[PDB]
C-alpha cells in the first residue's frame, strides 16, 4: 500500500457498493469464476431501477399535501405504471391497500 486508496465506485461514478456486490457474487455459488466488469455492470442497473420508483412515489405524495413517504404511496406509484405493474405482478406490499375502482353497471340510473 503506497498510493492513496480510492474506492471502486468513485471511478465508475456510482452510489452503490461495487466491493460488496463482488463478494456477494463470489460467495453465493453462482459459478466458478467472476470477471472484473460484472459488478460494475450490475450496480448501475440496481441503481437505475431504484432511482425511478422513488421519483413516482414523491410525486404521488406531493398530491396529498404531505412530506414523508409511506407504504401507500409506493402501492399507488406501482399499480399506475404499465411496466412496473408487469415486473411486480405477483407481489404483495404490506399496508398498501387497493386502487379506487367501481364498475359502470352498479351505479344508479
Amino acid at each position: 500500500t503506497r498510493a492513496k486508496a480510492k474506492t471502486r465506485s468513485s471511478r465508475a461514478g456510482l452510489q452503490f457498493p461495487v466491493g460488496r456486490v463482488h463478494r456477494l457474487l463470489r460467495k453465493g455459488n453462482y459459478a466458478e469464476r467472476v470477471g472484473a466488469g460484472a459488478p460494475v455492470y450490475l450496480a448501475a442497473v440496481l441503481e437505475y431501477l431504484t432511482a425511478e420508483i422513488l421519483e413516482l412515489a414523491g410525486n404521488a405524495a406531493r398530491d396529498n399535501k404531505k412530506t414523508r413517504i409511506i407504504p401507500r404511496h409506493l402501492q399507488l406509484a406501482v399499480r399506475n405504471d404499465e411496466e412496473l405493474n408487469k415486473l411486480l405482478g405477483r407481489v404483495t406490499i404490506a399496508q398498501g391497500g387497493v386502487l379506487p375502482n367501481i364498475q359502470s353497471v352498479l351505479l344508479p340510473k
Binding site: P71, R90, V91, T92, I93, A94, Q95
Partner: peptide, 8 residues
Amino acid sequence: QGRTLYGF
C-alpha cells in the same frame, strides 16, 4: 408457492 410478500 409464488406469493411473494414485501415488508416483513
